[PDB]
Symmetry: D2
Subunit: 32 residues, 4 copies
Amino acid sequence: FLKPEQQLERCRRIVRQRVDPHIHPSIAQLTV
Amino acid sequence: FLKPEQQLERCRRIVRQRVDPHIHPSIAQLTVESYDIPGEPMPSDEFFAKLDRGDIDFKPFMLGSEWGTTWGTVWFRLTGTVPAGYPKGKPLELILDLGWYPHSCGGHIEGLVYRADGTAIKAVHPLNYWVPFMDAEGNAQVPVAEDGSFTLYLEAASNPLLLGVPPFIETELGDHATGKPDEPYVFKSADLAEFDERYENYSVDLDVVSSLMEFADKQSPRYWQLAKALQRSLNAYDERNPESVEAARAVLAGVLAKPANASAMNVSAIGHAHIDSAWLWPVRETRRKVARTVSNALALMDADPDFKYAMSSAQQYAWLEEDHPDIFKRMKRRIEEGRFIPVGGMWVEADGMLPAGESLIRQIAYGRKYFKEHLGVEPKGVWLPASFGYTGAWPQIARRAGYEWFLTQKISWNDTTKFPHHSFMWEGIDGSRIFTHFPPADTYAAWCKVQELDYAEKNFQDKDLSDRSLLLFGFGDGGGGPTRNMMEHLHRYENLEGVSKVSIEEPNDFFDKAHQQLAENAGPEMPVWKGELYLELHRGTLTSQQDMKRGCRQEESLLRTVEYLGAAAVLSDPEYVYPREELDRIWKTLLLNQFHDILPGSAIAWVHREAREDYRRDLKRLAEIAQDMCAVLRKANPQADLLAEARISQFRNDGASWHANRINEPTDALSVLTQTLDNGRVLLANGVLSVTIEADGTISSLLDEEHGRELVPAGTRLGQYELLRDEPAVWDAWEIERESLLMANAVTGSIESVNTENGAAQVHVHTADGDTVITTTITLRPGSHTLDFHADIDWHERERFLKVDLPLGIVADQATYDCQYGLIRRPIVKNTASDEAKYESSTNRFAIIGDAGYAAAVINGSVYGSDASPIAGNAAEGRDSGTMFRLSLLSAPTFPDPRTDIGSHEFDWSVVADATVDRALDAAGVLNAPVLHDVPDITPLASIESVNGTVVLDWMKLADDGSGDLIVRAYEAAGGQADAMLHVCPALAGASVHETNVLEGDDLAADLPVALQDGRQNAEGATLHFGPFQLATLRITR
Amino acid sequence: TYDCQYGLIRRPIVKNTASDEAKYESSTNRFAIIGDAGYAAAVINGSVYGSDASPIAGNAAEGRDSGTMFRLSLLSAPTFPDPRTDIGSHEFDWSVVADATVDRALDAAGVL
Amino acid sequence: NYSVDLDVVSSLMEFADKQSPRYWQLAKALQRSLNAYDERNPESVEAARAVLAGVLAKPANASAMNVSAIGHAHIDSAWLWPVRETRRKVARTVSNALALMDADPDFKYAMS
Ligand SMILES: OC[C@H]1O[C@H](O)[C@@H](O)[C@@H](O)[C@@H]1O
Ligand SMILES: [Zn+2]
Ligand SMILES: [Zn+2]
């Protein structure tokens, strides 16, 4: 009834899309 | 002392560095000029017309530059020259590169090559980018001058890659053509090169040996012999001496000539290339993809004998015939030889669940007609490699259409359950059986690799009764097709130890041989699967893009009404002319819109916008045509009384099926009463029902009179809206996950107004969530057992799923749903993991849930997906028991369309308290019938009344000939034996009736029952004996 | 539909999966009912418990239409625990009810 | 012969590389042979032997090794018995070998 592989795939997708971008959110642009 | 892994690594390095570069060594450089079209694609005929009239610049282009826009086209003029007397016995091919991504194929840029005359030669693909230029003795595909100068054209299409290595990423590059360089690619290579077959053969042999070693069952003599042969071949090959590549090839000959095992299965391979009519690209690119695929197949046939290719969709055939007459003529000559096999005999590869039975019949009829009148080929089987499940009425329709076998491979995508058989007999709900085969390779586009063959051998589920499997090889789902490498690999696998015997064979011969072998071996113990082919995946396709389903159902109902009205008018007014051409065009447009990617709703925004425009235009045109036919009928029938607002719905109860009935007919029952309670609760009471509405606009008490039954369990609210978080890991638009359930959030509303327009009570409820507003009208009509709900929704959510709860208070183990031509039963209580996988099924206009002594029905307007669960309560609180039945309304995917179903939507449904099969069919027919105006109350052309059993006359139409005969299609809906007698209009006096097939071909199989005994009879008084879901078809001649 | 101790049970006649095939020999309690939507027939037994049911798919080219083969287990002759098992005289009673409902099946089972 | 065929088929199934066509074909052949054999009818043992003939006539694999077999019987001059019993053991072994040669052609025996 519980499929661990689906949980692993969902975890990888969630980390890639919804968790990692929220780390280091840009607040200002720099001039080079 | 010998390490096979080191040998494998050395072989891979040698192939990468010293063998592959020697294949196609460049001998000349080409000069390139470009002409860009940022907008719509430019037809080839008029392009070449102005080209030979001028009007084109062809600005010079340098190698390594960026050329393409997001959806534009580039025409490249390639000018080159050959060296002096260079073609010394070698083909001297031509190589073009457009910036192919190595880990991608069939989802990005492509191109086609044209001569100066205007005839295509061969398309270019990431894995197949060689174009034949000259022959060994000097024969060239293009004119060449004495100086050797030559010119060619290349039409390159630049399409965005919507499926990258990060799968399912939201994008905005699927709406239209922007004319901007969103992601340009480099060209960097256009060379004229020579062809050396020895190096290619050596590469193929090395690859085959390595792949055989990968699955050679280590610690066996074969593995070590292969390793030793590989080592010796690598040692004997010298790059400095070109001739040594011959001697190395002589080393691998010993191990490659070993005969196959005695028990190895026999595999028949047929060239295939799946092309979706509309998926991640519009139809305009679909036509070009079809042309490129056919050109590639023709080039492969020319360059290689003993190669066969199969093509399925008739619409693509028509598009190719209309666009490229020369390619069509070449394909026709190939067909006459028997090397190009048309399969399927259908307009498109439509979905197997959503379309109605008449839609599938029209698929088959139009496909067969096109195949007979334009190709002279009559397919013997159904070709549907990809489909999100099948209704289970397919075997009867296919068997009555003359088909003999079925093909399918999508069932392999199940989440938890493995289908018990690969080759078997699929039996419908009626009893008709057809021979079905599932390719064990689990794919329709094989790359011709040893690992695919080994997986197919180990995956077969009928090894004890058969040893025949079908392999479909080539590049699919984006065009392309089989390549030369695939043919060479197959030729190597023809007779090899450790690899099954693979031969090129027509699918008909394979199916005949497999069926005969199964009959011989199995006998009494022969596999049979009865029911539907449910797919445990893509369960969200029943709700995504609700406009598609709504338009499909509305168009089908309107087409039924229009054809009935036309048949009635023709038999009354001889001067009337039936609009056959316009109706045929509308039917073909709908059939194309019924594809397995448009109807589910998993394409880009452009495809769905075009489909919505087509639906709206066709609906308006059909309404106008129906109005014209109604006016003609009114003119021809002055004695009848006009009906200002009336509907015609098949199988209306009380023996008034095909009669036009008013919306508001007077009733003996008094007007329904309304009452306001203390806490804002609203009480509605007609003579048969009592409805109580709470302050939040949800039904809490639905009492049925004269039965003492409460239809709402205590502690549950009816009509409550639920919001779910839909964030699937894969296939966002396709999938709704189990984790989405069990976390629905209740959304509360309030009562706004109560009104009584024509004696029917109406209650208005507003529900708000934030930029999303639902306005619900709850209607109770006097003298009726049905409670009606109408909903207007302003969907503005994101990644959310909307559902409505309809508790029933009936303990039932199974629920009955409507099928295309019958009924199906699905479990409500899920005991095993297999049963749990069916947590989201489909409904066809109604569902019935009931115990032994009582039943209630839920009727829906244009909703397909739904689910049912038990409700086990406790007497310590008040909750007794029941069944929670929920309907899926809206969803908001993001991957294919960033804004999906954002806007206004309308829904209609109803609850029938005391319901049987007849009452459910009546309610479903009445609700789905289109509304028309000013119709005479004319006698129906034909009528079918059943003394015992339930017989529904599904369709009446005119024969698709000049004869003008009347075709009547009926079926048994209850599920048991039924007896009926046929009646006809007084105008049809002395007419004769006889039985035909679904295609009106007058030829039917002897195995199937007829249900019309004594053969030809008179139209009036004919007797019919319907079995369970008989689906009889009759033809009446005046 | 078969009789239970204090109710009724439903068992599949058409066996699609391997799990369904494992139930090729079930138990009956004084009667069994087999019927479609509009008709039903009952088999009443005196003291027989084991039985089985299978489909009958015929062809119109010969005359066999369709049906359900319902068989009752009467006697067996094992040898390991008892060398002579059920060797001798036995009596059995059963009946077929043409137009049968739950009430009629219960009536016939009680009377017999 | 039937016993030898059944033993060979069973031992082949024991190492038949399950999930391969050979394993399932051997299983089906064994089941059919067991079903076709009736102990009450002595002649049926012939017909059962005809069922296993199909799977026992399959040719060997191309890469299979070639094995040469020679009759052997190791006899220790003195180990757990005196020499007087060693002489009798030698005589018995030679007598058995001679009887096997008489009762079967194409048999060879080696002595050291
Ligand atoms: O399975 C999803 C997807 O698979 C393949 O790429 C094609 O058949 C598509 O038509 C389909 O939508
Ligand atoms: Zn597809
Ligand atoms: Zn020793």
